[PDB]
Amino acid sequence: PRYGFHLSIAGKKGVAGAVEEATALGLTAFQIFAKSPRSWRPRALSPAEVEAFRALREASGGLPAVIHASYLVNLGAEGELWEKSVASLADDLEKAALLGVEYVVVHPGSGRPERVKEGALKALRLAGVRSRPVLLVENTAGGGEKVGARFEELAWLVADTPLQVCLDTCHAYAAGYDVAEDPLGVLDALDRAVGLERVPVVHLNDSVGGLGSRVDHHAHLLQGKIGEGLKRVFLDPRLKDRVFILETPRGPEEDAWNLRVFRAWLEEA
Ligand SMILES: [Mn+2]
Structure with a gap:
């Protein structure tokens, strides 16, 4: 099984920096955000950065990558937060498609399950996503x-x-x-x-x-x-x-702690 951490995309290295850090750490998979999770504003992704990300990834193992949607996204919202959330998730999917990232993961949100499904489907449609990338929904702690x-x-x-x-x-x-x-x-x-x-x-x-x-x-x-x-x-x-x-x-x-545990476990496969 492949293993990794959530890596940063901040700084002059952009998303390419995450690919480099994954290689440096010896990870066999990694996850990133498509923009700062603290803000709704989408992060510009230049063609040069896209090329660098893909080239760097392919040159060092083509490690599986995952884009995590912000915690701000709530596909269960009844209010206009829903539209903001759907649009933000669509951005994650569009950015993932450009980068060649196969998966985008998001938490379901809170509210009617039917509203969440409606939101997930709308985001996919807005992004014009095909069989790739694939949107993943996480199970939650529940409550409320x-x-x-x-x-x-x-x-x-x-x-x-x-x-x-x-x-x-x-x-x-x-x-x-x-x-x-x-x-x-x-x-x-x-x-x-x-x-x-x-x-x-x-x-x-x-x-x-x-x-x-x-x-x-x-x-x-x-x-x-x-x-x-x-x-x-x-x-x-x-x-x-x-x-x-x-x-x-x-x-x-x-x-270091987490990698030592992952690797110790991997030896027991
Ligand atoms: Mn959590």
Whole structure:
């Protein structure tokens, strides 16, 4: 299984900088934003930057890449925040298409599940996206009016659409799926409801919150409540050809810790 982190695109290196950092760190997959997640403004992507990104990626393994939509996106919003969210996600998809990034992942949002599906489909249409890139919807911690806590709901969300799913282990744990003590059972449930063939990317986040706590607080590998449970997910034979992305604080110390754990686990495949 491939593994990586969420890398920065800020600075003079732009998105090309992320490709370089992935190679430097020795990652086998990576994730980036298509623009600052703190603002709705789209980030200009020049043809030269597109060429650099593609050339750099292809020259060093063509590592699978994922573009994460901003947390600002809420496809379940009833108000005009919906239009802003749909347009922002369409931008992510358009940028991904230009860069040759195969996946864009977004959280469902909060509200009526039907509104979320409507939003996801509208974004795909606005972006004029074909079979590529593929939009992935993540399962969530649930609670309140958050959509996607149950795998069965996600299965309905992607039914009759080209949407696929991104499993987040922290979200699942927070929602009530015992990834810590029954990681195999959680994957069995996901395969029955959604089908693992439609889960190309896994956000292998550990959790600060407890089982069914509805708390969405990511933790580094081995530093949360799931612990070695994530090892069982990472090494499950059914996911051996998937992409695993950790979404936690970045830095030399943090990265070294996480890479040492990922690599130790990989040796146990
Ligand atoms: Mn989260």
